[PDB]
């Protein structure tokens, strides 16, 4: 099994280590670090910085990275996470977003085509603050993602964990998003938007 147990994890990805992170990667020196500036309704909430684990999940990292910088063009139009939202929020579980196509969880597009396969399932969903791919079954990754708000190992081997948030502010912003009021479908009553994003 490629899935690492929690005692076999590489240096740089414990909660304590990630919370001491700045704007440079902790797991491998060539990992990109990207950011989202988040607004909740009309209220700026702060910035989430995210290390993408190119060393473990290069295709997943590069897809997310291009959607952060606006580098990817669809029909010659840049498309990505700027203006995208967190459309499904479940307190004590995770925050899900990145559906820039439809804004509701139905959208799927990647830099590789409509979907892309699962990379190796190396890391478990062992703690809060991890970035993982949303999908609709095997080999259906696209643009959506989630950030864990708790341990959620029942997702292991079904979703590729491909990044981690860096620094205390990042987690504070995640927790703010996690606690917004939601409707019966777990959709926030006031939109949670990536107003700006890019690479550090």
């Amino acid at each position: 099994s490629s899935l690492l147990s929690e005692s076999e994890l590489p240096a740089g990805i414990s909660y304590a280590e990630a919370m001491e992170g700045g704007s440079r990667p902790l797991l491998h020196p060539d990992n990109p670090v990207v950011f989202f500036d988040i607004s909740i309704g009309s209220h700026e909430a702060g910035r989430i910085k995210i290390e993408l684990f190119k060393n473990l999940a290069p295709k997943s990292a590069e897809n997310f990275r291009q959607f952060c910088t606006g580098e990817f063009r669809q029909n010659q139009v840049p498309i990505g996470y700027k203006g995208a939202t967190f459309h499904r929020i479940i307190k004590n579980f995770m925050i899900q977003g990145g559906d820039f196509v439809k804004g509701d969880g139905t959208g799927r597009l990647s830099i590789y085509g409509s979907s892309f396969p699962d990379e190796a399932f190396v890391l478990p969903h062992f703690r809060s603050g991890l970035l993982s791919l949303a999908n609709s079954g095997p080999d259906t990754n696209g643009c959506q993602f989630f950030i864990t708000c708790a341990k959620c190992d029942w997702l292991n081997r079904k979703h590729v964990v491909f990044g981690q948030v860096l620094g205390k502010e990042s987690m504070q912003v995640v927790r703010k998003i996690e606690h917004v009021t939601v409707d019966g479908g777990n959709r926030p009553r006031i939109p949670v938007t990536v107003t700006q994003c890019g690479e550090l």
């Binding site: 995770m94 969880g105 029942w154």
Partner: peptide, 11 residues
């Protein structure tokens, strides 16, 4: 329940 799908969220 507590999955993270894209299209038909299950229980």
């Amino acid at each position: 329940x507590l999955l993270v799908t894209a299209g038909i969220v299950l229980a």
